[PDB]
Amino acid sequence: INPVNNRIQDLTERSDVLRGYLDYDAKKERLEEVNAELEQPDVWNEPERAQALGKERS
RNA sequence: AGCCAGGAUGUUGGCUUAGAAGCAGCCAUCAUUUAAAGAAAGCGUAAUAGCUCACUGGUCGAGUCGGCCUGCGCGGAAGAU
Ligand SMILES: [Mg+2]
């Protein structure tokens, strides 16, 4: 049981560290603002901005 | 032929895609509601949407369709006294 217990904890550390490297906080806000621009009804009035957020949001 | 109705459902078949809804493709392509309606033939939408069509009903009432052999013609076909 304990080998797996440590397995989960190791993954905990790795996943939190990867959230650190990729800075999940700013991605969360940036994607949420991406979704803000996405909800913005004119989002597809400008195709360039729309597809920008398409690729960006993806 | 026109003309008038319908042109459905699961279901946007899924996946890759950013989106992909019949209609970018990949990719299956069935079953159901049936008069009949394609997991779509074209147009179209960023995507949907939307629009026709195939299919089918109803009014009209004699032809209509598109290949084969063959005769004669048409376009392709601009030059310098
Ligand atoms: Mg000739």
Curated annotation (Swiss-Prot):
Its UniProt miscellaneous note says: The gene for this protein contains a UGA in-frame termination codon after Leu-22; a naturally occurring frameshift enables complete translation of RF-2. This provides a mechanism for the protein to regulate its own production.
Q: How does the record describe the protein's post-translational processing?
A: Methylated by PrmC. Methylation increases the termination efficiency of RF2. Is absent when the factor is overproduced.
Q: Where in the cell is it found?
A: Cytoplasm
Domain of life of the native organism: Bacteria
How is the subunit organization of this protein annotated in UniProt?
A: Interacts with the ribosome. Recruited to stalled ribosomes by ArfA, in the presence of truncated mRNA, ArfA influences RF2 conformation so RF2 can hydrolyze the peptidyl-tRNA bond. Biotinylated tnaC mRNA can be detected in a stalled 70S ribosome-RF2-TnaC-tRNA(Pro) complex.
Organism of this sequence: Escherichia coli (strain K12)
Q: What is the recorded name of this protein?
A: Peptide chain release factor RF2
Q: What family name appears in the similarity comment?
A: Belongs to the prokaryotic/mitochondrial release factor family.
So what does this one do? Peptide chain release factor 2 directs the termination of translation in response to the peptide chain termination codons UGA and UAA. Acts as a peptidyl-tRNA hydrolase. In the presence of truncated mRNA in the 70S ribosome, ArfA and RF2 interact such that the GGQ peptide hydrolysis motif of RF2 rises into the peptidyl-transferase center (PTC) and releases the ribosome. Recruited by ArfA to rescue stalled ribosomes in the absence of a normal stop codon. A TnaC-stalled ribosome binds RF2, but the active GGQ motif is prevented from engaging with the PTC by TnaC.
